[PDB]
């Protein structure tokens, strides 16, 4: 019943700092060495660092070495990662993992779902919706939002679901994010999006 | 960096698609080392080039 | 820093086939190699460690072999849940390094894209910017190319696109391309065209719309 | 003893193509691997040594890489004069071992053979032996199949094929198969046939004659 | 001007002996290691033996160890290979090549043209030609079958009646049939009774007339 809850992510400016948290439950935290692994939008996995059970040891990937410091508090069963001199290349999802057993070679048997660390010159903000109509397929454009954590959902005028929901990943432009969702219908509807910095809905007309 | 498109053309009809990334020659070489593993149970093979060399077909017998 | 070369980058197979993903290390690592499987927007899961020992709850169709500098992950017979991305990792010495990963996709048959073009909404045209969207629906394989033309003028560095993941039903892809510009440049042209290319197309498909014509 | 393994055995490429061939070893040879080019009837020609050093008077498009157990040879752009066989060699220790070779041939559009059959000559008959010849002229690829049938009876173990090297003018091939029998045996049958299977042919082709009727 | 010229090859009786010679020129023969490398007809390259500059070191391939001996007379800038207990497996074109450097790991920077060795119990003989007219139930196709010759070193030429060279031949690799070699050659022509087939061989050149419609 192992669980690891990473928290502490959010939009941050280049140069500033952030501390990440990861709660552990379902095992004797104190006895196992923890790790940090991250993953940038659309990229592979990258080892961040690790710390043994008594903090006796720590190690880091040359990418964050010097800039990152890992720590733990067995008393309150939680893992910590301090991030200084944040860069854009730090924009990624951060995961914490335990080691299966008592050894340096141990594999990372259980991972959490991570926290999103977004490093940007802009302030976190909600999206501004715009309609997509022809000159049958209608669409919705989510403009300038940050961080990249948006969700689309459609509804008819008789407020209930719109089945043909199709969604494409976000594109990064000008420090901000933009995304579109398409709804296909057989030969107005209401577009709706969710974002940690404010939810919003729009009305897309039918030709 | 480049991507090598490879059609893994098995004798028994099946065609598997693979992509290898890296320097042209590092990917191409990795491509062959791969086909060399498959041949260990797929049989000796042969290759032909398409798309100036970025695409290669590896037929097994 | 022990170099990890995981190959292939991506592989297309069909339910039932035998799949082989190899991982090569720069220097010996004995047997301390681990395999992880990850799915869209999800935390990875440990599959095999010590090069061959399986993690509880893992189906025997997953095996491991190898020692020293060469290893192999083998899926005896590909299952629907087996479609994902796989990563190798050595844990012999710090720093721990991961492979670049192998994406295992569901091979289906060729399928041409359905294209649509959208004029920038007027409500948006007041905000200064004007993005022209062009969507390409359910096509396969993934390779597709979109080329924008303003008054027959090829366009560069002003278009962005996004590709969805394989659809759960028809194992096809979709693509959204946006030609972002300004009412400063937008209002100074008439013909806005979207040119699509795909293995399913014999000649490039086009969709356009002359401004102020709808 | 060091076993050399080149890849692929043969490759079909078009002029101006980017070619990279392989060569691996059972044990480490450090950097002491060498490459040679050989054309029909001519002795081998040193191209690269120590894995990456160009011999004098060797075009710059040729290149080398590798160390220990894996090596590569690269040709940035295939030139009409680069079509041949390339052997990798180990010089790290005795016995000095070579690789099987990699034959690089000219890729081109598929051409079907035009078949012909020849009955044994008279003077050859008077000498007790009868030899039938079948000829597949100007085809591509090289993969081809000849089925010999004497009175509709499939033959086996009494025929010998023979193929030219690609042609300097049209990059095609030509093959010749010779069924051999004793005059005694040749005179106990009537219809001598030759069935040719090729990719260029929609359906296997058969060419035959009737003993004496020529 | 580096040049290696092998010689002494020929047809020889299995189980007997043969001595090859490689006359060097164009470099200081005295200081380099020399190699013998053979090639069996149709197959890849096979390393045979090597000798160090001062003759102190000799090395052979397993297949020849015990029967083949390698030596050199620096005084004559000549590499040698004494072949004893010849085996049919020993049949091939024999090559000598020097090493590029004064180091044992150097590649072989120069090879001779080769000397053909034929271990056969048969005797050196010329070929017998036979016409080949096409039959059956584009344009015409005639041929020429040459066979029972040894060693395998023949040449095909075709001329018309007005002795005008015909260049549309092919070139088929010889084949081993009955302790000897056989080979065909064919020509394709558009739209005089016969053409002429001609073959070149070490033991006598032969000619032949081939019929047309």
Automatic annotation (TrEMBL), chain B:
Protein name: Protein L
Portion of the parent chain present: 476 to 536 of 992
